[PDB]
Amino acid sequence: HMRIALMQHTARPLDPQHNLDLIDDAAARASEQGAQLLLTPELFGFGYVPSQICAQVSAEQVDAARSRLRGIARDRGIALVWSLPGPEGPEQRGITAELADEHGEVLASYQKVQLYGPEEKAAFVPGEQPPPVLSWGGRQLSLLVCYDVEFPEMVRAAAARGAQLVLVPTALAGDETSVPGILLPARAVENGITLAYANHCGPEGGLVFDGGSVVVGPAGQPLGELGVEPGLLVVDLPDADYLQDRRAELHRNWL
Amino acid sequence: HMRIALMQHTARPLDPQHNLDLIDDAAARASEQGAQLLLTPELFGFGYVPSQICAQVSAEQVDAARSRLRGIARDRGIALVWSLPGPEGPEQRGITAELADEHGEVLASYQKVQLYGPEEKAAFVPGEQPPPVLSWGGRQLSLLVCYDVEFPEMVRAAAARGAQLVLVPTALAGDETSVPGILLPARAVENGITLAYANHCGPEGGLVFDGGSVVVGPAGQPLGELGVEPGLLVVDLPDADYLQDRRAELHRNWL
């Protein structure tokens, strides 16, 4: 009895008015289709431009974007997952993901642990906390961001805390078909969970993003998927015990 | 410049003379084809019959099988990976894998850490040591057994110790297509390694084994694969930095 939506679109670098207008439109359309939650892509509000976020995006501008996003969840009556720079100064913040419910209450916040490449590592501070897991809509939801999901340890950390549905804002460019095609199905199977992966698409900030937004069920099967063009993917989620069998006390000594 | 072979066949429960004759034949044929190493399936010497191994297979019988296997590696001039019950009494041994070189020297021994199901757990003691990693043929080889490979932690443990080629005796039944089809490609991609997976095939000990033996390269692609019938798969191996980027000191606290 759960219907989720994923927004796949192109953001304009450094134009949160435009980018949040796009999220607002997607939230309205998702709600009209009966979706109870909308997942949006990594850093969408400011575009995926790490060095320019560090150089030009102030904490006050981030907070104004966050306030508008909270208002979108409330005013469109839909839970919303967004991803922004963190709230600290440009030199002390990371990349984050947050979930607000349909009343605008922020239920969970998370800072990306696995930063991708030298530009992200120059612009952002990595997170130090495990993914949050919380009850919403009858299930345990969790958050990860982009590159995080490519590490089995990060998805296992969520599943170990009870996660059943892992929601992943992303920004995957360069025709990296192995991430949705190979890694995501395994993350689902090896934990027995569902994952939702919402990407940018098309040229943005000097890159051409892959699209390919997808929801993968616990058998590793796509429940729905997009191609390379902007779209709003709406998916109805249906109603080996690796998590129990794993010898975690040995594994943690062997990493 | 490395050519490996995988034996896929059906074993007869409790008939090591017959089963080791089959391994001897495969070793001869692999060597004739220029393969430098033969990988064989889990518990092949006695058949995959855990409860009957515990009830009827003595330590003396295991040692005699091990001695014959060492002689096969030496006399067929090929490195050999086999899997037998461990050397202790029936009540204190596990499922093991060992690698002998073409001179019959045992280079590495390993005890399966992740036992599969109640019959294995009643018949065998789980291992407590990480997978071994060793130089052979110009590369770092490692060993895991069956269900081990389905845990990302077990393959990561090997790759963290330098493994480049992970060799996996298995006994996969019940049409479990997600293991070779979904999990194995991810284990290869997420560590940047090659994996070789040698299964039983056909009815044996009350089960019908899947076959599907496969070698998967670091892009997650099958370099060679078998179907459901007995066969000898011969594969020539060619000449994101997940292993460096992973925040292992955080991950080990989150499992």
**Domains of chain B (ranges, CATH numbers):** 1-255 (3.60.110.10)
DSSP assignment of B168-230: EE---BS--THIIIIIHHHHHHHHT-EEEEE--EEEETTEEEE---EEE-TTS-EEEE--SS-
User: Tokens at residue A130, please?
Assistant: 């495990």
- What is the rounded CA–CA span in Å between residue A183 and residue B183? 8
Written in H, E and C, the secondary structure of B14-68 is: CCHHHHHHHHHHHHHHHHHCCCCEEECCCCHHHCCCHHHHHHHCCHHHHHHHHHH
Could you identify the residue written with the tokens 């330590």? B59
- Of A13, A12, A93, A89, nearest to A58 by C-alpha is A89
- What is the rounded CA–CA span in Å between residue A149 and residue A1? 26
Q: Mark yes or no for CB contact B255/A130 under 8 Å.
A: no
CA dihedral B169, B173, B178, B179 (to 10 degrees): -10
Deposited experimental method? X-ray
Resolution in A, one decimal? 1.2
Which residues make beta-bridge pairs with B100? B80, B106
- Of A40, A15, A2, A12, nearest to A204 by C-alpha is A12
Window 142-181 of B: residues touching A by CB (8 A cutoff) are 147, 150-154, 156-157, 160, 178
- What is the rounded CA–CA span in Å between residue B14 and residue B49? 8
For residues B149 and B155, the answer to whether their CB atoms sit within 8 Å is yes
For residues B234 and B7, the answer to whether their CB atoms sit within 8 Å is no
Phi, psi of A16 (to 5 degrees): -65, -30
- What is the rounded CA–CA span in Å between residue B119 and residue B245? 39
Could you identify the residue written with the tokens 């066969």? B231
Q: What region does A138 belong to: left with phi over 0, alpha with psi -120 to 50, or beta?
A: left
Phi, psi of A216 (to 5 degrees): -115, 130
Residue to substitute from A128, A154, A172, A245, interface B, most B β-carbons within 10 A: A245
Phi, psi of B210 (to 5 degrees): -80, -15
Comparing alpha-carbon positions, the chain A residue that sits nearest to B153 is: A251
For residues B58 and B47, the answer to whether their CB atoms sit within 8 Å is no
Could you identify the residue written with the tokens 């600290």? A88
**At what angle are helices B152-160 and B184-191 packed, to 10 degrees?**
30
CB < 8 Å to B114, chain A: 245-247
- What is the rounded CA–CA span in Å between residue B49 and residue A73? 57
User: Tokens at residue A165, please?
Assistant: 């549905």
Instruction: Write the CA distances from A109 to A84, A112, A253, B77, B214, integer angstroms.
Output: 11, 10, 29, 60, 42
